[PDB]
Amino acid sequence: DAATSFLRAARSGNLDKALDHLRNGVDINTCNQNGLNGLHLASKEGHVKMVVELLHKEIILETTTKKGNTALHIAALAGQDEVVRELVNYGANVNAQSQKGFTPLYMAAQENHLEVVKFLLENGANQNVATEDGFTPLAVALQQGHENVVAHLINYGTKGKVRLPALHIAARNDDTRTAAVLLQNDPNPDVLSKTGFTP
Amino acid sequence: MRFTFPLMAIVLEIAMIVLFGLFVEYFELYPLFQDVHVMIFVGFGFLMTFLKKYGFSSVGINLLVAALGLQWGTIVQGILQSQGQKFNIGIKNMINADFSAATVLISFGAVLGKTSPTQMLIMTILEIVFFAHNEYLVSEIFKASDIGASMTIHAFGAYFGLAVAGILYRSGLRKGHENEESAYYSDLFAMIGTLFLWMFWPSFNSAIAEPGDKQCRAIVNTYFSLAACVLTAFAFSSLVEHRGKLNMVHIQNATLAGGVAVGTCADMAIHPFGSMIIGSIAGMVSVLGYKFLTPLFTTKLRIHDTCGVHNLHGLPGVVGGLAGIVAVAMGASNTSMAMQAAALGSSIGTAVVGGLMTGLILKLPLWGQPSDQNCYDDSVYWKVPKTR
Amino acid sequence: MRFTFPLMAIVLEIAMIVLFGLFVEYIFFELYPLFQDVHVMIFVGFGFLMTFLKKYGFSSVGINLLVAALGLQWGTIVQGILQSQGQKFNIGIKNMINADFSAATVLISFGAVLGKTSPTQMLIMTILEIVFFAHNEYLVSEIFKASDIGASMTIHAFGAYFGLAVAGILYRSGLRKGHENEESAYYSDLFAMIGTLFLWMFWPSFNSAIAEPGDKQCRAIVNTYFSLAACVLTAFAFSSLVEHRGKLNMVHIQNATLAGGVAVGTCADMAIHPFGSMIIGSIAGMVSVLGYKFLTPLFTTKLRIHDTCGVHNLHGLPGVVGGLAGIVAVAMGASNTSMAMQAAALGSSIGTAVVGGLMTGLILKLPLWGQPSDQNCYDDSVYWKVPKTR
Amino acid sequence: SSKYPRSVRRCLPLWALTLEAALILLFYFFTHYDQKGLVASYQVGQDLTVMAALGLGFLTSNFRRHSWSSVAFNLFMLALGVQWAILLDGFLSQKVVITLFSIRLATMSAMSVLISAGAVLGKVNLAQLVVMVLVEVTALGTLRMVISNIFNTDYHMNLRHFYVFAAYFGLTVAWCLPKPQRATIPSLSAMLGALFLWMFWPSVNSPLLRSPIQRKNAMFNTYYALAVSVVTAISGSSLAHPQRKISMTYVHSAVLAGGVAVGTSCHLIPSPWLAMVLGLVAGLISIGGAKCLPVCISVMHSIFSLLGLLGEITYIVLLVLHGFQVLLSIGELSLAIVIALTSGLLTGLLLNLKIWKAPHVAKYFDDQVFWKFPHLAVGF
Amino acid sequence: EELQDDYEDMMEENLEQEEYEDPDIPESQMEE
Ligand SMILES: CC(C)CCC[C@@H](C)[C@H]1CC[C@H]2[C@@H]3CC=C4C[C@@H](O)CC[C@]4(C)[C@H]3CC[C@]12C
Ligand SMILES: CC(C)CCC[C@@H](C)[C@H]1CC[C@H]2[C@@H]3CC=C4C[C@@H](O)CC[C@]4(C)[C@H]3CC[C@]12C
Known part of the structure; x- marks a missing residue:
């Protein structure tokens, strides 16, 4: 009853009720019968504050559903731009693959989510990672007639990560919470930028 | 040899001319004939244009097969009705010839993308012979009522094509084919044939119906059956698909x-609500067939049906025959129940056996059959444009 | 210059309204289904048949619609004035069918100059060609009193030859060796199949609308039905025969059928017999395929006449064959009327078509109607807003 | 909210099947059956049917990625609307005797809704269109019955106002919807539809x-x-x-x-x-x-x-x-326009309900919302 | 705006590597 109510609060964005449940002792890593934890549901519904709070309370960021979908997969398929930016800021793997081989960039490209596609490309998403059927983000964008996504995917090409590493971004804003989450995930504080500078 | 197809076409046409000279002599039903004609050449022709690289062959071989079929069916049905003497050509002869063309096109839908035009000419000739003999048996020996031809046209053509496709089974196509896939504008073009068939x-069911109450009953019952069928086909297409998405195969065919x-039961007194029940059950059955039975037929029974003509013509045709039996049992018609059952069994059995012999003839490597890799490709028999 | 096309169209429409007010006043429901089939032919069959060009579908179908819509009005006026000899006349279903026939003749001629003309040129050619066609068909039906119920001579041969004459006056050297836009596409050919199938079915x-009710109308229907059936088989066979590696050509399947x-x-209403109708259809399909294969390159490269849709191979050569068949039927004695008058109708149709086309093309040649340049031929974007996405 | 469409696997089939079962039951309880010009009278209704299905379904298919939905949704709307119109003109103009003339009139009632739907196609799903069909057919029947009662005209003859009713009803429903393109081949298909409409x-x-x-x-x-x-x-x-x-x-x-x-x-x-x-x-x-x-x-x-x-x-x-x-x-005319606008307001407010699982405004005019396509990630 | 500093080029320009180098010792010789 408590875990199910916590998941309902995560879905509806009731951050106060979810925080009360977490204070009571509900396991933050609990998930429904589909394997969606609170982070997955919040990423689906675009609840940015809930996503941030759950990341601060040490939820496993790369937990996959029964379909292999991370929270970033779900936010990209749902077209939740702010959630995608926040998850990438906290160290979400932009090149994660589901069981069927889908990447977050593929999910954004198939759903005509231009802003998510551009943000993932600037964060080093590889557009050449194919699914188990051999389809690329460009291929599915062409099949679905998403002309803007196709054009942006062609123009970007293989330029790569033009955003700073997430720890550099956190150090620029003096953000200790995001830096703490990032260092909990990746224990290397000397992550290098392309210019060679540490955070 | 590349000259097989033109030589066969010319020889068949010359034989048609000679038979017409030997056996043939010279207005209220003409609009109904034109409706049937539009069904034959546009509805069936564009209904199979869903394949992304087989639109040319689908529509063109539809036109060619039906053009040969109307002549050969005219000849065969006329000789059967005249018992070998000369006969006159009315509007009813043209309507029945278009019906024979419809049967051959239904069977064509089963082997679409895997056969040559030469095979199609041969199958047209043989299948029309078998279909006309079965239709004569049903109409004259059994004297069963099949005015919409659920048994004599649809079930017969579907099971004939299934037998042919079973004989022409290719082990390399059981798991699927890269060319066996629809395109966006191709499905849009298939909607044209779907809409024309639904409209007219x-x-089709009332062209040769007895004028008066029977013809009006056929029109009204067919219309309301189609109206209910559309709703139930949409509903079950949503029901059987992930997240309730609609499948264009179901919308194109099961409607x-x-x-x-x-x-x-078209000309029987089954009432509009009875026709609605029949259409609803038909839509349900067709969607379920497309979703579940077609993969079972292809993978386990080794019967690949390209257009899923089983789910549209065979199972709904069997349902129509069973509905005729039940309607007789309820007193909706004066025909005997045993004769309706005999007509159903004869249609299915004659279709299967004729399809086996016809497919055995078609299996001979003399007709320019496509290779496994070149199946569902217009480029085998057509000059294909370089852009879509 | 910019407003030439709308100004000419509004002036023509006002003229049509005035003529209808001055001359036009108000069996119908028996012939109306046949008129509906003819109407569908005129506006869907020809219109989508000409949409085989990959970059000219909009202009094909839309200019077909414009030409036929103007043509029904103008043909009503001209044919009624000719029949009444200048007096006020009533209009029935037969006037509607005859006006649609005049529109069909103009559309056949349009198929020759498709992709190289402007809508203004098309309006002018419609107005002039309907006059020439109506005078020729009046001569054939009333002076010669020949039998042309399916109008192989008065519609098909006339439109083909009149269009070819206009094309020769309008012929452009830059187009002799082909054009990058004179070129078909997959879905364009499917639309052309829509047009072909509707023409073939209805x-x-078309051939039985004006036939005398009874035996003649039924004979026309049956003969056309079986002739088209035989023609499909022979067209497919010879398309396979003449092409490289036996591959079928969609041009042949779209037109020669x-x-x-x-x-x-x-010979439609004549007692040719179904086998006789079938023999003519088989010859027609053969001749049309051979024309498309051999005579069209000869006409374009050496003749100096460019025929975009190959309307010669569909309307002119089969039209001449239909006129020859009618003369043979009189020799057979199946049909009344003299051989000499059938031959006169054929010769008059061809001669009036060539003369009227030459004068009409001389008028259309003037550099005032906004005809496309050589590079912009067969391109919708000259006159239409073309979507970026295909 | 999520731009990914919610699953309609429980809403749409239940809605459509319940509608069809209710229609069948009403036809059983209230409809009843019953020469020289049988085919001639049938042809007028057939021509209306050809227009309603082909011309109206393809006329709106001009959208770049919404041709499937336009054509198929028009077919579904016609099939529902003719049945419901038969029942409604039976109820408001008397059991229901089913003739070809009644089918023709019900087809006209359906084409009114089909014309109105052009203002909203590309912005609604199938269930919303079902609601629109039902409410618009009912409103047109109510308007005709009101005109028959007041101005002493025939109920069937009042169907002449269907152009203006359909136009204003569609405009009103479109105005109520949340606020948000062509391709060559869909344009040619739309020209086919427009040609059939113009011809008949x-x-x-x-x-x-x-x-x-x-x-x-x-x-x-x-x-x-x-x-x-x-x-x-x-x-x-x-x-x-x-x-x-x-x-x-x-x-x-x-x-x-x-x-x-x-x-x-x-x-x-x-x-x-x-x-x-x-x-x-x-x-x-x-x-x-x-x-x-x-x-x-x-x-x-x-x-x-x-x-x-x-x-x-x-x-x-x-x-x-x-x-x-x-x-x-x-x-x-003023009563017709007033009823059209009022029923359009009501239909638009009903269509704005959350339970219809309407497409996100960022997903308008897109077949992928409603139709299955291959090589897509599905679900979460 | 407010997010340009998250990109590598803008961060490179902000850090000003040229300010940690010895640029030159200019003489500007009077003769030529
Ligand atoms: C009409 C249908 C539904 C019922 C009757 C069809 C029967 C007779 C058909 C359909 C499936 C067919 C079989 C399918 C596959 C094979 C394997 C092949 O290497 C030899 C032929 C063989 C063994 C076929 C023989 C004929 C067959 C058994
Ligand atoms: C196809 C097999 C499974 C049978 C299922 C079809 C059933 C549902 C159909 C077929 C025949 C139909 C009947 C045919 C005739 C009549 C007489 C009429 O006055 C009332 C309706 C009634 C009684 C129909 C009701 C529905 C019916 C029973």
Whole structure:
């Protein structure tokens, strides 16, 4: 009853009720019968504050559903731009693959989510990672007639990560919470930028 | 040899001319004939244009097969009705010839993308012979009522094509083919044939109906059966698909199952609500067939059906025959129940056996059959444009 | 200059309204289904048949619609004035069918100059060609009193030859060796199949609309039906025969399959017999395919006449064959009327078509109607807003 | 909220199957059955059916990625609307005797909804269209019954107002929806639909005319007015376009201008020149509406509404020739427009409900919302 | 705006590597 109510609060964005449940002792890593934890549901519904709070309370960021979908997969398929930016800021793997081989960039490209596609490309998403059927983000964008996504995917090409590493971004804003989450995930504080500078 | 197809076409046409000279002599039903004609050449022709690289062959071989079929069916049905003497050509001869063309096109839908035009000419000739003999048996020996031809046209063509496709089974195509896939504008073009068939099916079921109460009953029952069938086909297409998405195969085909399943009961006093029930069951059955039975037929029974003509013509045709039997049992018609059952069994059995012999003839490597890799490709028999 | 096309169209429409007010006043429901089939032919069959060009579908179907819509009004006026000899006349279903026939003749001629003309040129050619066609058909039906119920001579041969004459006056050297836009596409060919199938299906109504009710109308329907059936088989066979590696050509399948309907027209209501109708259709399909394969390159490269849709191979050669068949039927004695008058109708149709086309093309040549440049031929974007996405 | 569509696997099948079961039960309880011109009378209804399915379904298929939904949703709406219209005209005009004439009238009632749906297609799912079909058919029947009760006209004869009712109902429903393109091949398919509509619109202008001479004159007037309107629409399109080119989208609807202009008065126009004048004026008004209405959502629906109003006005002008009748007819038109707008408001507020699982505004005009496509990630 | 500093080029320009180098010791010789 408590875990199910916590998941309902995560879905509806009731951050106060979810925080009360977490204070009571509900396991933050609990998930429904589909394997969606609170982070997955919040990423689906675009609840940015809930996503941030759950990341601060040490939820496993790369937990996959029964379909292999991370929270970033779900936010990209749902077209939740702010959630995608926040998850990438906290160290979400932009090149994660589901069981069927889908990447977050593929999910954004198939759903005509231009802003998510551009943000993932600037964060080093590889557009050449194919699914188990051999389809690329460009291929599915062409099949679905998403002309803007196709054009942006062609123009970007293989330029790569033009955003700073997430720890550099956190150090620029003096953000200790995001830096703490990032260092909990990746224990290397000397992550290098392309210019060679540490955070 | 590349000259097989033109030589066969010319020889068949010359034989048609000679037979017409030997056996043939010279207005209220003409609009109904034109409705049936539009069904034959546009509805069936563009209904199979869903394949992304087989639109040319689908529509063109539809035109060629039906053009040969109307002549050969005219000849065969006329000789059967005249018992070998000369006979006159009315509007009813043209309507029945278009019906024979419809049967051959239904069977063509089973082997679409895997056969040559030469095979199609041969299958047209043989299948029309078998279909005309079965239709004569049903109409004259059994004297069963099949005004919409659920048994004699739809079930016969479907099971004939299934037998042919079973004989022509390719082990390399059981798991699927890269060319066996629809395209966006191709499905849009298939919607044209779907809409024309749906619009003109009442004339199909009422063209040769007895004028008066029977013809009006056929029109009204067919219309309301189709109306219910559309709703139930949409609903079950949503029901059987992930997240309730609509499948264009179901919308293109299962929406027409009401026309097939009401055909036996079209001119009977089954009431609009009875026709609606028949159409609803037909839409349900067709969607379920497309979703579940077609993969079972392809993978386990080794019967690949390209257009899923089983789910549109065979199962709804069997349902129509069973509905005719039940309607007789309820007193909706004066025909004997045993004769309706005999007509159903004869249609299925004659279709299967004729399809086996016809497919055995078609299996001979003399007709330019496509290779496994070149299946569902227009480029084998057509000059294909370089852009879409 | 900019407003030439709308100004000419509004002036023509006001003229049509004035003529209808001055001359036009108000069996119908028996012939109306056949008129509906003819109408569908005129506006869907020809219009989508000409949409095989990959970059000219909009202009094909839309200019077909414009030409036929203006043509029904103008043909009503001209044919009614000719029949009444200048007096006020009533209009029935037959006037509607005859006006649609005049529109069909103009559309056949348009198929020759498709992709190289402007809508203004098309309006002018419609107005002039309907006059020439109506005078020729009046001569054939009333002075010669020949039998042309399917109009192999008065519609098909006339439109083909008149269009070819206009094309020769309008012929452009930059187009002799082909054009990058004179070129088909997959879905464009499917639309052309829509047009072909509708023409093929509704041709019996076309050939039997004006036939005398009873035996003649039924004979026309049956003969057209079986002639088209035989024509499909022979067209497929010879398309396989003449092409490289036996591959079928969509040009042949789109056009030569209607040659049997074209060629049976003069003999449609005659007692040719179904086998006789079938023989004409088989010859028609053969001749149309051979024309497309051999005569069209000869006409374009050496003739100096460019025929975009190959309307010669569908309407002119099968039309001449239909006229020849009608003369043979009189020799057979199946049909009344003299051989000499059938031959006169054929010769007059061809001669009036060539003369009227030459004068009309001389008018259309003037550099005032906004005709496309050589590079912009067969391109919708000259006159239409073309979507970026195909 | 999530831009990914919610699963309709439980809503849409339950809704459609419950509707069909209810229709079958009502047909069983309330409908009942029952010569020389059997085929001739059948052909008029067949022509209406051809128009409703083909012309209206393909006319709206011009969208780049919404042709499937336009065609198939139009088919579904026609199938539902004819059944519901049969039942409704049975209930409000008496058991229900089913004849070809009743099927023809129910088809006209369905085409009213099909015309209205063009203003909302690409922005709704199938369940919302079901709601729109039911409410619009009911509202049209209520309007006809109210006119029959007040102005003492026949219930079936009041279906003449269906152009103006459909136009304003569709505009109102579209105005209630949340706020948000072409391709060559869908444009050609839409031209096919527009051509069939234009070719058979004389069957729209005389289903309800019992007399033969009235049908003849109305059919002639519609044919000639449509020809004039086609010429005017194609020629004047270049004037009403920024790039001075002919707009295929404008042509697709402006071809029907003369038919709408003479729709309610073609039986009273005595000479073809007057119908030709009305077609010309309709074409010019279409040019002006294309050039001016966008300055002041669907522009083609807006000019359709203007043209329906113009047809009503020319009916008023002609009815005097063949002033209390003017007042009665103006009151009839005002009541029709008022009921159309009010029922459109109600339908739009019903369509805005959350339970319909309507597409996100970022996903308008996209078949991927409703249809299965291969190589897609599905679900979460 | 407010997010340009998250990109590598803008961060490179902000850090000003040229300010940690010895640019030159200019003489500007009077003769030529
Ligand atoms: C009409 C249908 C539904 C019922 C009757 C079809 C039967 C007779 C057909 C369909 C499936 C067919 C079989 C399918 C596959 C094979 C394997 C092949 O290497 C030899 C032929 C063989 C063994 C076929 C023989 C005929 C067959 C058994
Ligand atoms: C196809 C097999 C499974 C049978 C299922 C079809 C059933 C549902 C159909 C077929 C025949 C139909 C009947 C045919 C005739 C009549 C007589 C009429 O006055 C009332 C309806 C009634 C009684 C129909 C009801 C529905 C019916 C029973």
